[PDB]
Amino acid sequence: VFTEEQEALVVKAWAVMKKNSAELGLQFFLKIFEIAPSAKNLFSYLKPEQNPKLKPHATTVFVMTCESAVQLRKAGKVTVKESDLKRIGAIHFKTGVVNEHFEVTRFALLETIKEAVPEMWSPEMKNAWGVAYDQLVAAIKFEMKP
């Protein structure tokens, strides 16, 4: 169960990091592609890793993760609109985003956060971010079908 403490951690960390989300987004994607260069292929428009569209995807991940933390504490579930979730779910399903991609991204997300606010980093900070993300992903994965 997602706690008020974990919510506070995600909310404040994001509050801090959000001041430099430009540097943060670039770092995040550079981490994703350092680990799995071939993940590049999934973003069909990539065929510099400088691409315009990559920066908002990065921040979406951050914002929606922080939002899930809030909703999880408030209502005990991800309460993202049923329709936003179907739409996000379908695109990921159709471009071939698989578990390993979500998983590389989780790992990249945590590293990016550890590097960005090393002064707020701790295993509870890591887990709070990790769990909000996991619940967000599971809400999306339920909508990854035909």
- What whole-number distance in Å separates Cα of residue 132 and Cα of residue 118? 19
Chosen residue from 8, 87, 122, 124 binding ligand HEM by CB under 6 A: 87
List CB contacts of 115: < 8 A, sequence separation 6 or more.
27
- Looking at this protein, which amino acid is placed at residue 63? V
Using CB under 6 A as the binding rule, whether residue 97 contacts ligand HEM is answered as yes
Q: How far is the CB of 116 from ligand HEM (least distance, A)?
A: 17
Does 106 show up as a binding residue in the annotation? no
36, 44 contact by CB (below 8 A): no
Closest listed residue to residue 97, CA positions, set 43, 138, 59, 139: 43
Q: Is 68 annotated as a binding residue?
A: no
C-alpha span between 130 and 113 (Å, rounded): 11
User: Which part of the chain contacts ligand HEM (CB under 6 A), choosing from 6-14, 20-28, 37-45, 114-122?
Assistant: 37-45
Task: Please tell me whether residue 129 binds ligand HEM under the rule CB under 6 A.
Answer: no
Instruction: List, as residue ranges, the binding site for heme b.
Output: 44, 53, 57, 87, 92
- Binding residues for ligand HEM, rule: CB under 6 A, are 39, 42-43, 53, 57, 60-61, 64, 87-88, 91-92, 95, 97, 101-102, 105, 133, 136-137
